[PDB]
C-alpha cells in the first residue's frame, strides 16, 4: 500500500517542504507507504532546491532525488514545455521508474503544481503526459493552484492557466483546485493571522493531503482508499475538478472554547466561507460529496449530520444523484506541528465535492485571457520559444466546450 | 440608485425564502396525513374482510 509524490516548481516543492515535515513528524509498518522518502523535488531554478540541500533535512532525502535544472522557465509555458523541459523531464521520469520499481502495491502518483508559472504549467503537463503513457491505469492525484481573479502576482498567468488546463483534462484523473486568495481569506477569518505568508498556506495544504491519505496509513472504522475518489466523485470522464475544504481550521484560543462535534463541523465544511477555492457553491448544484473523518467519530452522527445537510434548502443537489455522499472514518487524530498555527483537535473533517461553481471559474478566466489574446499581446514570447498562433485559439475553444458541458449536465 | 435597487432585490429574495419555508411545512404535514389516512383505509379494509 504505497504512494509516491512528486513536487514540481517553486510552489510545488515549497508545499512539499511542509508535507514531508508533517509526515516524518507523524510517523516519529504504517510508515511503509511513505518511507528515505518516496519523493522527487524537481525544478528548473537551483535556488529553492539548494535550500532543501542545505536545510535541516539534508540527510533525509537521497541526494539524487533532488532534481534541479540550470536555468529558469521565465514564467513561459512554452519555455518550460519545449525548450528547457526537454532536458530535465527525461531525468525525472527515469527516477520515478525505479522508485515505482522498489514499490510493490503502488496505489498511484500524486503531483503538486501551480498552473500560473512556467515550470509548474509547462513541464508539469509534460511530465503528466509521459506518465500517462508509461502507466495509464495508475491514479494521478493533481493538486493544482489556479490563479485567483483579483489577487495576482503575474501578468500572463491567464495564458499559462488555459494552456495548462487543456492538458490537465485528459491526463490527471483526480484534480483538486486551490486558489491563493481564498486561503488568504481563510487564514484571515478563521485563523486570525492578519499577515500571512506562503508558509502558513503550505502548512494547511499539507493537513488536507495527510487527511485524505490517512486511510492508507492507519486502520479506520470505515476505510476509503485512493481508488474510491476515482469512482464515487467523478460522474463523467471530463468533469474532475473538486472543491476542497477542511474543518476545523481554528486558532488555539477559539478551539478550546468551542465544542467540536461532527454535526457542526459537517456544517462548517459546507459553507462557502471555509473553502479552498474562491467560488460560490450556492451558484452551483452539487453532484457528489466525499467526507473524510479523522479521530473520535462513530458512524451514527456522521450519518445524522449528512441527513440534516440534505434536508436544508440553502444548498441544493442535482436531480441525477439522490445519494450524493461518500463518507469515511479513521481512528487516528490529526497531528500538529510545533510552530504550526493550528491547535490539537479531537476530530477533523476534509470535504472533497464536485459542483458547477467551477464552471463559473473557467468563464471568469476565459474573459481575461480572451481580452489580451485578441490584440496578440504577449503572444510573441511564447511563439519565439517554439509555439505558434494556432494552439492559443484551439486551447480557447477547448475551454469553451467545457463551459457548455457544465451548463448541460447541471440541467 | 444601486444602493436602493439592492434593498428591493433583498426584499424580493426574503419574500421567496419565507415562502420556501412555508412550502416545507406543507410538504411535511401532508406526508403525516397520508400515514394517518392509510391507517383509516386499512381499518375499513379489515372491517370488510371480517
Amino acid at each position: 500500500r504505497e504512494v509516491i509524490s512528486i513536487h514540481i516548481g517553486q510552489a510545488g516543492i515549497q508545499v512539499g517542504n511542509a508535507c514531508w515535515e508533517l509526515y516524518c513528524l507523524e510517523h516519529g509498518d504504517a510508515f511503509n507507504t511513505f518511507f528515505v522518502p518516496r519523493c522527487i523535488f524537481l525544478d528548473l531554478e537551483p535556488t529553492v532546491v539548494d535550500e532543501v540541500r542545505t536545510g535541516t533535512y539534508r540527510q533525509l532525502f537521497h541526494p539524487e532525488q533532488l532534481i534541479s535544472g540550470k536555468e529558469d522557465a521565465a514564467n513561459n509555458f512554452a519555455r518550460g514545455h519545449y525548450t528547457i523541459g526537454k532536458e530535465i523531464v527525461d531525468l525525472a521520469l527515469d527516477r520515478i521508474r525505479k522508485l515505482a520499481d522498489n514499490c510493490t502495491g503502488l496505489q498511484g502518483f500524486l503531483v503538486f503544481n501551480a498552473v500560473g508559472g512556467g515550470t509548474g504549467s509547462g513541464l508539469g503537463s509534460l511530465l503528466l503526459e509521459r506518465l500517462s503513457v508509461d502507466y495509464g491505469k495508475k491514479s494521478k492525484l493533481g493538486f493544482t493552484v489556479y490563479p485567483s481573479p483579483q489577487v495576482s502576482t503575474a501578468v500572463v498567468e491567464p495564458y499559462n492557466s488555459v494552456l495548462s488546463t487543456h492538458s490537465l483534462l485528459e491526463h490527471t484523473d483526480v484534480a483538486v483546485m486551490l486558489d491563493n486568495e481564498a486561503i488568504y481569506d481563510i487564514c484571515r477569518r478563521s485563523l486570525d493571522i492578519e499577515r500571512p505568508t506562503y508558509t502558513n498556506l503550505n502548512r494547511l495544504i499539507a493537513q488536507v493531503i495527510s487527511s485524505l491519505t490517512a486511510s492508507l496509513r492507519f486502520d479506520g472504522a470505515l476505510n476509503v482508499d485512493i481508488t474510491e475518489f476515482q469512482t464515487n466523485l467523478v460522474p463523467y470522464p471530463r468533469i474532475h475538478f473538486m472543491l476542497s475544504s477542511y474543518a476545523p481550521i481554528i486558532s488555539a484560543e477559539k478551539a478550546y472554547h468551542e465544542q467540536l462535534s461532527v454535526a457542526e463541523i459537517t456544517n462548517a465544511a459546507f459553507e462557502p466561507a471555509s473553502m479552498m477555492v474562491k467560488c460560490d457553491p450556492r451558484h452551483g448544484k452539487y453532484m457528489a460529496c466525499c467526507l473524510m473523518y479523522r479521530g473520535d467519530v462513530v458512524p451514527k452522527d456522521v450519518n445524522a449530520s449528512v441527513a440534516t445537510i440534505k434536508t436544508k434548502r440553502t444548498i441544493q443537489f442535482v436531480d441525477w444523484c439522490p445519494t450524493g455522499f461518500k463518507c469515511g472514518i479513521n481512528y487516528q487524530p490529526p497531528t500538529v506541528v510545533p510552530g504550526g498555527d493550528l491547535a490539537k483537535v479531537q476530530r477533523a473533517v476534509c470535504m472533497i465535492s464536485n459542483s458547477t461553481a467551477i464552471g463559473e471559474i473557467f468563464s471568469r478566466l476565459d474573459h481575461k485571457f480572451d481580452l489580451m489574446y485578441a490584440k496578440r499581446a504577449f503572444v510573441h514570447w511564447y511563439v519565439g520559444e517554439g509555439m505558434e498562433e494556432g494552439e492559443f485559439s484551439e486551447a480557447r475553444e477547448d475551454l469553451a466546450a467545457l463551459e457548455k458541458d457544465f451548463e448541460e449536465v447541471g440541467a | 440608485l444601486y444602493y436602493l435597487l439592492g434593498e428591493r432585490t433583498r426584499r424580493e429574495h426574503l419574500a421567496m425564502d419565507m415562502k420556501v419555508r412555508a412550502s416545507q411545512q406543507l410538504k411535511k404535514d401532508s406526508a403525516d396525513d397520508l400515514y394517518t389516512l392509510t391507517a383509516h383505509f386499512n381499518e375499513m379494509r379489515a372491517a370488510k374482510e371480517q
Partner: protein, 419 residues
C-alpha cells in the same frame, strides 16, 4: 454429521463473521487459544458442525481487514491457510469486484472451500456473510455463490446480506450495486435474510437505548441472529427443525426467498432487571413491527409465512396458543389462502446469559416496498448514464443494467400479484 461451512466476504462480511465466531466459540466453551474449557457435555457432541479450529474462509481484497482480524482476540484461532486474500482491491466497483479482480482470486477461494467441503462427510449447507453496497464484498461474494451452486447443487445456502437505504447511504454508487446483486441473488441463493443499517440503528435507539452504537454492537446483533438460527443442529430439542425444514415451510414460490428477521429478547441495561421472561411477552416483542431488521414495515402488507425458533426449557402448549392467537386476532395482516401460517420450533439450550430466547423469520409481502424504494434511485441515475463509464469500460454493457431492472421490476410485480 450435518456440517456447515462458513464463508466471509468483504469488509462488512469479515467484521460480522469475526463477531460471529467469537459468540459461537464462547457458546462451545473454546478459549481464544483454541482449547476446550466448557462445563456441559452436550456441547462436545455437536461441535463438528462448526469445528478446535473453525471451519471458515475469510476473503477480501485489502490487508487492513485481515490485519484487524488477527489483531483482536479470537484472531489466533483461524487457520492461516484459510486467509485466502487478494492484494489490489476492488473498491466500490461491482464490475471490478465481479469481473476484473474476482477473475484471479476466485480460483483460489474455490480451492480452499472445496478442500474444506470434502473434508467432512455430509454437508448441510454454506453460510455467507456479505454486503450489497460495496464492490469486493458484494460482487466477489456474489460470484462465489454462483460458482458454488455449479459444483454443489443439492446443498443448502444461507446469505446474510445487508442492503443500502437512502436514510443510511454510505457511497454514491449504492443502487448500481444493490440492483445487480439482487439480479444474481434471486436465481442463486436458497434464501436470504435481509438486513440494513437503518433498521439496526433504529433498534439500538428505541429498544436498546444505546448512546453510541458503534459497529461492534450491530455486528453483535446480527451474530445473535445467526447463532439462533442453527441452534437446532447443535443442541437437542423437544421439536427439532433444521435449516432445510425452515426453507420448505417458509418459501411457497421459488422466487420468494428474501426474509426479514428479528430477535427477542432485546432490553436496555436499565430495564434489564425490571422485566419478565415469558412466552407471551416474547411474542409481543417478536411480532412488533418496530423490531424487524429491515426498512420495510410489514404492517403495510400481508404475511405469507412466519417462523419462530425458541431456545430454553419451555412448555409446547404455550407456544401453540400464542401462535394461534396472533393469527386469529390480526387476520387481515396474514394471507387467507393458507391456514395456520406459522411454523414453530423448540430447543432446550438457551444462549449464554439468557434463560429463554427467540428468533423470528417473517416472509412478508412488504418487501416489495424496499425493492421499489431502490429501483427509484437506480432508475434516475441510469437514465442519464451517471457513473456508468467506470463500469462500462470494464466489460459491462447497458443491457446488463436493463436486465437487472427487469428482474427488479417483475419481482415486485409478483409480490404484488401474490398480495
Amino acid at each position: 454429521m450435518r456440517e456447515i461451512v462458513h464463508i466471509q466476504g468483504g469488509q462488512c462480511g469479515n467484521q460480522i463473521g469475526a463477531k460471529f465466531w467469537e459468540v459461537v466459540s464462547d457458546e462451545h466453551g473454546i478459549d481464544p487459544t483454541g482449547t476446550y474449557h466448557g462445563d456441559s457435555d452436550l456441547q462436545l457432541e455437536r461441535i463438528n458442525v462448526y469445528f478446535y479450529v473453525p471451519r471458515a474462509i475469510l476473503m477480501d481484497l485489502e490487508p487492513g481487514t485481515m490485519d484487524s482480524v488477527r489483531s483482536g482476540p479470537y484472531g489466533q484461532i483461524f487457520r492461516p491457510d484459510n486467509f485466502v486474500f487478494g492484494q489490489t482491491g476492488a473498491g466500490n466497483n461491482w464490475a471490478k469486484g465481479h469481473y476484473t479482480e474476482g477473475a484471479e482470486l476466485i480460483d483460489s477461494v474455490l480451492d480452499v472451500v472445496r478442500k474444506e467441503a470434502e473434508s467432512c462427510d455430509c454437508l448441510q449447507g454454506f453460510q455467507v456473510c456479505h454486503s450489497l453496497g460495496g464492490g469486493t464484498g458484494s460482487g466477489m461474494g456474489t460470484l462465489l455463490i454462483s460458482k458454488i451452486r455449479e459444483e454443489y447443487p443439492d446443498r443448502m445456502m444461507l446469505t446474510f446480506s445487508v442492503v443500502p437505504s437512502p436514510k443510511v447511504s454510505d457511497t454514491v454508487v449504492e443502487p448500481y450495486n444493490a440492483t445487480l446483486s439482487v439480479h444474481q441473488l434471486v436465481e442463486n441463493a436458497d434464501e436470504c435474510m435481509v438486513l440494513d443499517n437503518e433498521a439496526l440503528y433504529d433498534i439500538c435507539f428505541r429498544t436498546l437505548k444505546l448512546t453510541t452504537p458503534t459497529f461492534g454492537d450491530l455486528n453483535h446483533l446480527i451474530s445473535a441472529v445467526m447463532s439462533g438460527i442453527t441452534c437446532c443442529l447443535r443442541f437437542p430439542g423437544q421439536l427439532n427443525a433444521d435449516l432445510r425444514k425452515l426453507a420448505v415451510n417458509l418459501i411457497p414460490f421459488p422466487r420468494l426467498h428474501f426474509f426479514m428477521v428479528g430477535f427477542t429478547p432485546l432490553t436496555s441495561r436499565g430495564s434489564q432487571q425490571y422485566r419478565a421472561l415469558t412466552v407471551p411477552e416474547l411474542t409481543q416483542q417478536m411480532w412488533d413491527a418496530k423490531n424487524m431488521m429491515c426498512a420495510a414495515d410489514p404492517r403495510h402488507g400481508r404475511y405469507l409465512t412466519a417462523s419462530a425458533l425458541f431456545r430454553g426449557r419451555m412448555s409446547t402448549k404455550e407456544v401453540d396458543e400464542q401462535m394461534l392467537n396472533v393469527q386469529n386476532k390480526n387476520s387481515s395482516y396474514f394471507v387467507e389462502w393458507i391456514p395456520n401460517n406459522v411454523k414453530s420450533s423448540v430447543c432446550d439450550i438457551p444462549p449464554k446469559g439468557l434463560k429463554m430466547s427467540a428468533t423470528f423469520i417473517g416472509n412478508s409481502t412488504a418487501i416489495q416496498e424496499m425493492f421499489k424504494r431502490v429501483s427509484e434511485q437506480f432508475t434516475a441515475m441510469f437514465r442519464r448514464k451517471a457513473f456508468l463509464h467506470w463500469y462500462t469500460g470494464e466489460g459491462m454493457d447497458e443491457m446488463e443494467f436493463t436486465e437487472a431492472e427487469s428482474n427488479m421490476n417483475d419481482l415486485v410485480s409478483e409480490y404484488q400479484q401474490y398480495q
